[PDB]
Design a protein that fits this description.
The structure is a homodimer of 222-residue chains. Chain A contains one helix and eleven strands. The first copy, chain A, has 222 residues and is mainly β. The first copy, chain A, has a single domain, classed as Green fluorescent protein (Green Fluorescent Protein). The first copy, chain A, has an eleven-stranded mixed barrel. At the A-B interface, strand 10 and strand 11 of A face strand 10 and strand 11 of B. Chains A, B: Belongs to the GFP family. Chains A, B: Pfam families: GFP.
């Protein structure tokens, strides 16, 4: 009953990639009913030291549309509003990696995602730091399974980002979410979320920003 | 001055793939200002004989955002409102092909795209007819060049559609647009449109349909 309409979303990330610090602030609204997200972020420290496409998976999966028969597999929402803690280790192939740790919960009537990120081992002339990534996004599948020992889930997936020269910089995602609360939560059978995104820019916007459009649906349980 | 706000769009396609006929009807609105499209289609003949993702490129490129310095390269809009004729030959790898012919123009205050399509040579157990395509979409680049002899353009690109088993069914696009009117039109220098799309479903919708979200920007001219 919390995600029955349009929920306001607020995001906040502090990061450090190879010693460079940045902050991103973002606002938007989600609608679990359609599993649609609209978010706008702004680098609040001037210019972003890494390409926007690498921060998309870091920058609120509770927003997924779960079909009615797949309702009892929604760990995401069954953990609200105390929230859950999402933890990730993202490995960009032949490059460095992001270690992230976020806390997603309701702070009043707004759903908030507070992130802390540390990148390390990035090649100064690779696609990330080199900014050879196209400003766009592809569809991927987010694999999920229960982690009972933790009363949470384990999620893994791989994203593919296009390079200017026609190639693909693959990023490996190891994920984990544990509830913030102490009560029973919903532990899912194996399944995944079909995820699709499109990035664009507000033309009136002066700050270095990114407009993110997203749709997410669960699948895999028959 | 015609694409300065939100323009209503109407689409209409009659097709025949390996002898099976279908019709799709669609409505939506575009906003060249952001290069955002929102469209909803409905198979009006019951169930669609091929997967929805194969009809996305067929189902209104005048909607692209062209940055101010790239303004004189917009053939698409410089051909309105008499419209232009878009013609395509799409070759799905190791499978059949779609021959399409559309006519895009303003019919009053609505921008309309009337399509006629014929598929042929499809493998009865391939990814198309087999329906082994995931319901999602990827980002691609739409290459453009002027075709002076015709007073139009030539466009080529290749799309990648995901298969259920983790592979990719590539589709090759040969395109051509010629003006319907007899006046000088704008012929572009070589460039492309970054294109991004996300597909979803209206949950209240009973008919076999598809909700298409799209963003398009030109690039390549400095």
């Amino acid at each position: 009953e919390l995600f029955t309409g349009v929920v306001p979303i607020l995001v906040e990330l502090d990061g450090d990639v190879n010693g460079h610090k940045f902050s991103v602030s973002g606002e938007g609204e989600g609608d679990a009913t359609y599993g649609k997200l609209t978010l706008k972020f702004i680098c609040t420290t001037g210019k972003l030291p890494v390409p926007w496409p690498t921060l998309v998976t870091t920058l609120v999966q509770c927003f997924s549309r779960y079909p009615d028969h797949m309702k009892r597999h929604d760990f995401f929402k069954s953990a609200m509003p105390e929230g859950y803690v999402q933890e990730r280790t993202i490995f960009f192939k032949d490059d460095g990696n992001y270690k992230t740790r976020a806390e997603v919960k309701f702070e009043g009537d707004t759903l908030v995602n507070r992130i802390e990120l540390k990148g390390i081992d990035f090649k100064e002339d690779g696609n990330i730091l080199g900014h050879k990534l196209e400003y766009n996004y592809n569809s991927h599948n987010v694999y999920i399974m229960a982690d009972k020992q933790k009363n949470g889930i384990k999620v893994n997936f791989k994203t593919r980002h296009n390079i200017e020269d026609g190639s693909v910089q693959l990023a490996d995602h190891y994920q984990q979410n544990t509830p913030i609360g102490d009560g029973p939560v919903l532990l899912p059978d194996n399944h995944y979320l079909s995820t699709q995104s499109a990035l664009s820019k507000d033309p009136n916007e002066k700050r270095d920003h990114m407009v993110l459009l997203e749709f997410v649906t669960a699948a895999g349980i028959t």
